[PDB]
């Protein structure tokens, strides 16, 4: 009643002896598969501005004036696991080599090795405020490297058919945050080719579309008529 006992015979497939089946992560590499996580993370990512605008109180709270400016940083010594309490590890771009963040360093290293698996693991790991705050700061100014590294990282991501609703919302957050600079230097060769191969992998997503169209139409017809 408090633990689970093994239904394995005494005398004188450990999941099947403990009556469980831990559902495997994806059944086939040619099958779309959502994230192992809450379903609401997509909606939180897609509309977290209007959700927080809802969540604000109706009038401003009464603070003091002789309040310390670095109140968020002036803790003591249960440790904070946010993007604000992040320290750098171990000659002027937006993030030097001593002041690179973990996301920007892994994005650059994946651009070297042409394998963004650790980048995508960090993206699927951290929280929606951290995701918005990392995508919103992506060096959209002179040569456009960090944008195109993010785009072909998402390409390598949704080639793998896992976490794909999150890779779709990361692309939506990219187009929302600074799709205006992509529209600005449209016909730039690197960013146009990165969007080209993203569309090359992304155009095979209508399998889900006509699959849910069939299921919706025939389910409605069978239930009503």
């Amino acid at each position: 009643q408090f633990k689970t006992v093994s239904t394995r015979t005494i005398d004188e497939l450990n999941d099947i002896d403990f009556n469980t089946y831990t559902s495997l992560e994806q059944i086939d590499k040619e099958l779309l598969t959502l994230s192992i996580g809450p379903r609401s993370k997509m909606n939180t990512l897609l509309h977290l501005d209007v959700i927080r605008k809802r969540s604000k109180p109706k009038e401003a709270p009464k603070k003091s004036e002789k309040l310390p400016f670095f109140l968020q940083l002036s803790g003591e010594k249960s440790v904070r696991e946010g993007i604000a309490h992040e320290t750098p590890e171990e000659f002027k771009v937006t993030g030097r080599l001593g002041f690179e963040s973990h996301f920007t360093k892994q994005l650059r290293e994946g651009s070297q090795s042409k394998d963004y698996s650790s980048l995508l693991a960090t993206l699927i790991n951290f929280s929606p405020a951290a995701v918005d705050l990392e995508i919103r700061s992506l060096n959209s100014f002179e040569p456009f490297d960090e944008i195109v590294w993010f785009i072909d990282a998402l390409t390598q991501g949704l080639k793998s058919n896992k976490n794909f609703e999150l890779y779709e919302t990361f692309m939506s957050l990219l187009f929302k945050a600074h799709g205006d600079v992509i529209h600005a230097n449209n016909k730039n060769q690197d960013i146009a080719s990165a969007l080209q191969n993203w569309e090359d992998v992304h155009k095979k997503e209508d399998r889900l579309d006509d699959l849910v169209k069939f299921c919706m139409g025939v389910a409605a017809f069978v239930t009503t008529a």
Partner: peptide
Amino acid sequence: TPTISMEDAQPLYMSN
């Protein structure tokens, strides 16, 4: 206004 904003304070929503 968005009907997100016309709702209660909870993590979810019902209509956008």
